[model samples]
Target chain A: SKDNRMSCTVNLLNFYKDNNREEMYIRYLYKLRDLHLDCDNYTEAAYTLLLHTWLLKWSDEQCASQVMQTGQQHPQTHRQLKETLYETIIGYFDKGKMWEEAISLCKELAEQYEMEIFDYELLSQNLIQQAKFYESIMKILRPKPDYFAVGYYGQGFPSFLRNKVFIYRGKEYERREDFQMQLMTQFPNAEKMNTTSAPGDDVKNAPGQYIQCFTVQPVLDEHPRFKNKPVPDQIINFYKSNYVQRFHYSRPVRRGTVDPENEFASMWIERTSFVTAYKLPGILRWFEVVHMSQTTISPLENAIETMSTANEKILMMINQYQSDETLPINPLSMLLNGIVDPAVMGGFAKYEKAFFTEEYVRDHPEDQDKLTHLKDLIAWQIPFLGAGIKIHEKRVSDNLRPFHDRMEECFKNLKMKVEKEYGVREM
Target chain B: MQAIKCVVVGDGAVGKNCLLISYTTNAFPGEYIPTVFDNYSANVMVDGKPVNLGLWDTAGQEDYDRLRPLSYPQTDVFLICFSLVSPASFENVRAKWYPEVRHHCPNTPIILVGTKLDLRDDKDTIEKLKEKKLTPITYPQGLAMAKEIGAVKYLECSALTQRGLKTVFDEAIRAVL
Candidate 1:
């Protein structure tokens, strides 16, 4: 009975099609998608809806214009209906899990076929729309269970305090500075060979980085241990200090007009590169949909300066706690002040309970709380677990050095107070 | 005594089907299938030589983008059309249609045709267009876009009234030869 009803619909479409009643033919075409949807055949419904797009003429009278033109006002609202219908077909494809079809269709609408060709506002909104679909695919992706590999710090219990190897290409490079050095070594050979005497006197060849695409790994979201956890700040500092401190940063020669400007003015602009799974190759599509990591735009010369500034930041971060002339509690105080995340700072109680084999706590059980809080604080300093502010005029760094001087003065007063109160001392 | 394939492209509803049907003949098979029709394959004489002008009518809707290129490989020429009264379609001649066609048929000749010729001077059409803050695509604009896209020729026609329709097809064949 269903077959009979469907054939009658096609026959009706054929009649209208043959008679050149495209208006009626499309009206019947709309019915076929409904028929497919009523039977829960989403894939067929999607194709039927896609086929309906073929007949979406600008005005209804485009194909039936002869008779319709005899009437007044030309009954034309335009092709917003076409955009809506195409969107509807993709929704049907999404239901059927036809992700590639959805992705490609989304790309065409967002990138090439802006409904209003000159409307860049709409173009950007369409781009954001396409990026949203890539993220949606990322949410639904299911990777192999063992795909994400983890790295550890110590042999056993504290292994969770380590960095992870992500789904990026450069993780194999143990030292990115080694790769940076290779690029510099390679840059001068080809660049100097093309230029003037003495291997190029200031031809502006420089080692730098450029942006490219990546396939987002699903485990960054789906795995319980790693969800919402981007690699923390300290691991990057550890890598940066040992590696990049010696790399030379120079103005990169560029072909276009060079605009030299302060990064303080330039880096605030909201810029992002929109890449989609559709833009990648077929084999690469198996990875999750897409991720948008935002950075800034600066001229190569300005970039070289800021890259140098960033390297200086790593050196300051690594050496921040090194001066241990005072009893280490001053470093401990600085570290504790920086602890904002409750997960790690809050984990100190567990660290105390797990390693509770010490005999000193038998008599000083009353002092257990303060002792553990102060001792655990130092471990945080080993990683420079907090950040601080400094100023120009080395007086600023010299200013905080006066802080533990007060600590040195305050500790002497505390020992005198302990002797006078308890009446127990060598004197 | 030969055949030349002339494919038409534009934004949706820019008189693409009307142009094709006005010139000859036309679809619906299934999903991912370009509904092939028989409205094309005209017998013509260009430069005094008999040629079958195989007019390929493509869906200008955003949906048929990937499938439209499949018909491009054998195309001898392209008739990239935009409505003379629809400024967005005219703009997309450079923005969308030109890039899409050029990417596939890099060496094939293209004749940029502006359709809806009678409407350019129509009082009611002009009112409707300017109501939306637009004007009918002028001949100079059409020629300018054609010049920009490296289209071999720029032509205007009314498939509704068949004004300059023959010339649009004639140029398509001539560009191929």
Candidate 2:
């Protein structure tokens, strides 16, 4: 059986070399390693294969492969290989210059192996230094920040301080603070310290205290005032992490996606504005004139009057925004009103030109009842349409407010600068 | 006071605007100038019921054929007026105007008005028609043509004399009611 397994392993390796199926080859190699160990044959080939794969950065699979290849049934029995595994992780962190990651990995490895190889004082100091370096370089950078550093602060370093409960050798520490205190008491000289540096020199640093002992949970990533966006690499690599996982599902997983179907609604409102203001009101007036003995004093006269008043209201708001920058009314309201005129012309003018005539009535005399009911239909339907326009306008105002405020602030600053230099007051 | 929106259409220089102005203001407009997209309004007492009669005049020239039908929707009645003194305008009543109106407002009531009654009896107008081997379109001919085209009513008018102008609009409003 052992001979057959060894021969099968050799054939698999040859086939793997030709096809370059790394996962398959690794799986078969572990089986061959088991056979060699059971039959007391040399396991050097299997060990070498595992080591080479691990060196090539084939991570957890290779690590498990290496431990099994060493003829150890249980991972805990392969103490030396476990040490090597920890060293490999540390080497990777050192090569990347990710000192905080190195400390985290070392602590994780020590807890697993029941080894006290890492110095808590040195690890904490290094972690603080790494945090300071990243914070100084990344503060105030809008749109995106260093994700790896952000992750370290939010997730990695918190676990390391034992500030959170951690599991070790089937035993749980409910309070990490207790664990940290126990570790600190065993080594009295290792003390938490703060660096004395001028505050705000590098905006991320505290005044006269540069290096804090622990990383403050990063607020920059989750700050409501700042829209922190994920970099492409961060999204792909951290697919399982909170920052990127929601993208794996549907339905606008991020913020800022609302719609009231405004374009079509705006067009309808424009049509209704002219029809209601110019045509329907006149018809209603005439209905009163005949039924109630009122005089027909030019229906369009009132229609034009109403439109002129509406136009005046729109113009007044616009002039107020332009003339007195101190006014608090949203400039976007003016823009929304501005949109109404064109929408009315584009939508209603075409509609009126298309269908408000005698020829149209002659062709579709069947629609006489529809024509008679058109006024009532519009009266009933307009509120629903009006609601949409209102919602769309409110959303537009909300979206524009921040940009408007910023632009106004910029203009004010420029005005103040010019006014001061020229010694002239604002008009 | 219910409203009636009536659109007047016929061939160019067939007295469409004169017909509208005379009906609304009770006076003929000066000269025969081809107008496009003209609007007129009148407050009339038809059958003891007050009505707002809105008259929309469209250009009858082939150049405005594309634009003319834009005024054809939601119409209560159509005044398809043709010049009784012009045989060509009379021919277009069936060839162009009837087809165009029926194509757009298929079920709306159409009143065929034979305009220019004063010119139909004028010596010079009859001579001019005779020179072309054509005579003024008679009343019976208009009535027979109206019947063939399924018109709601047939009437003759002279905008210059204000003859049958008030009656023409009264029938138009009655057609809607």
Candidate 3:
């Protein structure tokens, strides 16, 4: 019976499939998909799940006996079900590096209108959306050589990024030989990143990467230095894009509008670095403690330079390619480690600071979670969802006495510069 | 028996308080800055129903930004004002005020009011503006802005003579209903 378990499961699966017992049929199809995945048979694994789509039937209210009709479906349910099914199949193919079949599904789903009879609502949407979704997958699989390049060659030390399994589409593409072949075959004319008339040194070092075919065009930000001198659109994009990633995002669930051009939907106000002024003394405390140390001659001055390029101020001093999570990613919370202290206070200030505060909160209520998460990430002192507490009412429990003593010295550093330049405080 | 909260906002000296003062007290800079008029209410009859028309004022100054939205919780309607004689303030109606109100109160209906209509036709005002190569923001331009900001109505009024002032408040209350 133990040996016969597989066949019996399959036999029982078919009985349910034939009788249209949806609850049991889909359950074992998922189980069988895992069994195929356990055997590393990507095609069979995906095919099992793929078969469930065929068994799917929608119950119409007109069928008074509650027997589901074989063919037509609610357009919303139909599009959703089929889209997820096909998308799953393509992902299995993607994981196996079945590049040919994966791209084939892209083309397949792209022609959803041609292959199947669907309600007009689906046809209207699928025609555009499926192509857009598949195009993103296709780009990951067969990336245009001009737009991307091999990264982290020597950028992150001691981590063998080149040898590691690279992510192509949805999953990791483990075989390096296949990756090389894919890269080589797809862009036969691939050459070094000579993207610009005056190519950057990093681009020159990266023998081959994709460079943009078109020129750039872009601001939430208005920096003081750029009054007479305009900030290049590239730098502004650099801040918004890299500042989020800081190069450390996970799947990006903070509004997929990613970046709308107009400032009307900036997601959050993200107050200027002055909000982080309270943390200026923490830099000195970290240095004095020597709790964490890097080999440096003047560590205190060095800490200022590291964290001072903070929040938006980071944009001022940041080179176009200065992002590397190894450069600490601010890693979260001040006073944790001084190893590249970007404890990157303070912005993502408050919940209600967003421009579209009312509708955005109503629509994306869980947005408060990310807002609070970022608030803690910038300068958290305790292990709590401390963001739920108001900003001003940060119930004191820190170095109270030294805080005042060092706080003035913190103001003195800036006051010296301000008094020398502006004569008097205008505000 | 319902109170219609109508908040007014714009850049400084765009005649917001002037509009409120003239409507409530019944100003050519006359009822100027008495503890900076926070909120004013008037009982007015519209469609045979007496409603409390609550008019809220905002600080037209900078640096008190954090405290500004403290008054904006459950506003029913907005009257984003600008001076008909001030082109920059008119520009700010679209640029600053419209977006700010919509942020705090997305679904709230807005009535755009161009204040200081008295200055729009004044000779010295016209001459002073000409020194800067500027002219009064005309009614046609305001209509275009009202369309752009998606305002419920376009209006102009003067606290100096109280011309077209009653219609402005009356329409503001009407929009809340």
Candidate 4:
């Protein structure tokens, strides 16, 4: 027990000696950083923070400020701040150089933090996507300090993972008796908001929360049917296979399959944000207000179908993650379970709008009953059965560090693979 | 003998007259506004059975609710008309029209008639059609919506060309029968 310190030091020293042991060193360092942060040993923890910044290559100023605040009096504190801030700024000023800097930074920081499973491929794809358009560059870079897009710390590096207890926690075990009390007190009669927030608005407080992740790849844009070419017979075949017959097949086995695991067999159409001049304001309203048409028959049908399927799939994945014997350690699912489903099943805000109307109840006195009906309808729809998941952090053990390191490496390799496969030059 | 029973209901300037004329005579109208009510019937035997035809056409005006209650009880099919060109009719569909009809007969199979598809060429009309789909309906919006809520079928018709009235009636009759 007393050798816990010595054991971690030796494990990390050995890990640093071998490239394959990279994740272990990162996790071990993160443990040191957090333990030091907890003990208020801000100076000793500063180097760990620096290591994380270099590996993740992506961070916000808030994270850097957090580490800085703890070590303001340390001699290297100024250097740490300059390295993190300057690299991020230079990455942006170099126009296209941010891409590689971000990649390297992500790897270094990922290794330092011991990110369990970084989505480096997704990150790289997103970066290359930004590189493709000058508009994306302008949009992302225009309204900030020179380093705003690059963010602070690691010069070009930033940390993506947090060792905080909330990071590994899922949505399964949270007791929302208090939050629900607050919700019911203010706005009680909202429909479906409690169970699942609509795609347009009413999103819960979660990062990367979106109903659909629009693929930036130009594959959807280059299709012939978009230009009014005669619909291919293959398109009709897809209509029947995915929608009607329910052939749960795979997406096309393309030559440059950067993320086959992420694709599903579905008929999807991409629409540009371009506005049409001939469109009347109210014509689209019919499609919006009418429920029956929006999901099944409209052009948005694919997204709707995909969302439902995604919900079902995510539920199953959670179930599997819970039951799998070989893979005994999983806490992310629990964290996800805590926050997502309640927002989906038990939170909404419709009655707030109705409560404001003086005539809303006078004319429709029975609205009180309607409000209850909507709430009950939503309660009946909670997916998979668990109020929420419980989460607790495991101690930093030398044996567990290597497994986390592998996850970081997987993401690093994935990022490079997607870049070449998509023929995207890094910006 | 059995014939399809179809009723047209909406507010003023919703093209109910053009829709009925288009169905009865298979005639195209060059220019038209909305209609109140006119009933016309043609004998067409389905499955080799002869039946008397009945159609209840109501005025597309403020008092359309007066004729709506009468249209519900005996009706085997209901044709709800909305001019794709009239924002007022569109609002009426949400505010006054749908609930009133449901109060009388909720089980009726109503086909959404977006009258004047020829107006799709008109910039305003085309824009209106686009807006209708964005309003977040309780159910899906188009043909797929018909299947989900158990509608027989759906069509976006042009009264000027009688382009979709036949298919609308034919599908509605098949559902009722």
In model 2 chain A, the worst 10-residue window by lDDT is A268-277
lDDT of 4 by residue, A1-427 (tens): 2123523553464467375555555556656656655544433344344454444333333333333333342444433454454344334323422232334444443442345335576446544544544333322321100000000111111122111000000011111222233323432232212211123213322333122111110112233444666643323222221111010111112222332222211223322221122111110100111111112222123323333433443444454444443333323321232123211111122222323246645755655555444333223223222211211112212433443333334334533543343233221
Per-residue alpha-carbon lDDT of candidate 3 for residues A288-313, written as tens digits (9 for 90 to 100) = 11111122212112222223323233
Docking class of 4: incorrect
- Candidate order by lDDT, highest to lowest? 1, 3, 2, 4
lDDT, candidate 2, B2-60, per-residue tens: 66768788876576766775555432122111111135566655765666677766667
**Candidate 1 local lDDT, A226-311, one digit each (tens):** 44667333323222222111111111223334323211222222232223332211111111224444444333223233334333
Q: DockQ of every model listed?
A: 0.01, 0.01, 0.01, 0.01
Among incorrect, acceptable, medium and high, the docking class of model 1 is incorrect
Chain A, model 1: TM:
0.28
Worst 10 residues of 4 chain B by lDDT: B28-37
What's the lDDT of the predicted structure labeled candidate 1? 0.48
Off by over 4 Å in 4: A1-427, B28-37, B46-49, B64-67, B124-150
lDDT of 2 by residue, A1-427 (tens): 3333455565676587569766566556666545644543322333324333343332233345533434443544344555555565455434423333455555555454343444566556545655553453233111211111001112212222212211110001112222334434533443322221112324232222111121111111232423465433322222222121011000101112322222111111001000011111010110100111112212222223223433343344444334434432223232222223221123222323333467767877775665444333223222322332343343444434543343344334533543443344311
Q: What shift in Å separates residue B148 of candidate 2 from its native position after superposition?
A: 0.7
